[PDB]
Each structure stands twice: as C-alpha cells, then as structure tokens.
Amino acid sequence: MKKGRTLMTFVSVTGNPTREESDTITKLWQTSLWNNHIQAERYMVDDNRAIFLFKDGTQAWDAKDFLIEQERCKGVTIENKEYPG
Numbered sequence: 001m002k003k004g005r006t007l008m009t010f011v012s013v014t015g016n017p018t019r020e021e022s023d024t025i026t027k028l029w030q031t032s033l034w035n036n037h038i039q040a041e042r043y044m045v046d047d048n049r050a051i052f053l054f055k056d057g058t059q060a061w062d063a064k065d066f067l068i069e070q071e072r073c074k075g076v077t078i079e080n081k082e083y084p085g
C-alpha cells in the first residue's frame, strides 16, 4: 500500500524564538526520533512552529509523547487535536 500512510503534525516551540533558534531546537528532536526508529521530515513554517511529517503516520502519537516531554516544546497538534506541552 502507498496512500494514507503518512501523517502531518504541527510542533510548537516555547518563548519567542527566532526562526533559526526553533530550527536548531526542532532539528534536535527530529534526529532523536530518527535515531529511535521514528522517521519524519521537518519543515519550519513559523518562527516558533514546525511541521513534522511522519513517514509512518501511525508513529505520530508515540512521537508526540516524546515531544511534549521536552522543555522547549509548547505543544503538538495531530489532526486538529492539540496536546499541550
């Protein structure tokens, strides 16, 4: 199967970060997830907000559990459902 395999999510960063600061931070998270068998593409969309696109969308909730445990993670959104950090 090809279609409906991936899932997009939004990850927000706390404070008033510059785009480059959020970039450094969210990159750390992306790599940690990658190193733990959760592969995702990461795109900056705001100064404090990135899209995490999970290659295996099923993993999005496990990734979310990891993400919200991070100090600079403001929250994660999965399909219009917000999980506060």
Ligand code: NA
Pocket: 014
């Ligand atoms: Na906070």
